[PDB]
């Protein structure tokens, strides 16, 4: 039903012992939440530039 992504939430809890969310196969050891959250840290600026 239009569901499913590269990564699949496994029975393993997110790396962070404070994150109640599980870590996906493409987000591990972090989860979808943290994963993206971390990305912000590193940025290449505007696509154009
Ligand atoms: Zn997490």
UniProtKB/Swiss-Prot annotation:
From which domain of life does this come?
Eukaryota
Compartments, record wording: Cytoplasm
Q: Where are the zinc fingers (A20-type)?
A: 8-43
> Which residues of this UniProt protein bind Zn(2+) 1?
14, 19, 31, 34
Please identify the protein, giving its name as recorded.
A20p50
Per the record, the gene is: TNFAIP3
Which span of the entire protein is present here?
381 to 416 of 790
